[PDB]
Amino acid sequence: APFVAPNVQGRVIKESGYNTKTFKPAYVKPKHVIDPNMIIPRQPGEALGTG
């Protein structure tokens, strides 16, 4: 703080500003097509012969 003799008025102090930032997000679209080609086939779980 400024030292100021008790008689006189005092001194005026400057102050600071602001700064700003902004962002747009990204977009994501994974998808699958599920054919009978992919469903009919066996799944390791199934037994042999008669799944």
Binding site: P36, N37, I40, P41
Partner: protein, 124 residues
Amino acid sequence: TSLPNYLAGNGDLGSWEPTQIFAGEADIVTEGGAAGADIEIYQVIAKNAAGAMVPHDPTATEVPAPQSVAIGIAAQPAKSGQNVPYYIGGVFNHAALGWHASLDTLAKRQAVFDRTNIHIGNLY
């Protein structure tokens, strides 16, 4: 290799016919030795000039070559260099065995083994 089949069809699992090798009770005798050529199950095999098993080959030569005398029946398949187990004694169905060409009729198939502990014959 996954791709299902859609079109309808007649589905068979194939067929099975017992391969009856033995036709008698003469005691069975088995040995084993290095193969000199590719050998299939129950194929009739000689021993080549180097002493390695080789599929029997009549008329190989000039003096007939040692491939030309049968010596046993392969008990399991093998590639060259591998050891082949093979029968040397027993009574065998002439049809179950693998035979050379031109060695077709049972008469000839027996003529290949009269002098030995192997005998080859019919099944009733």
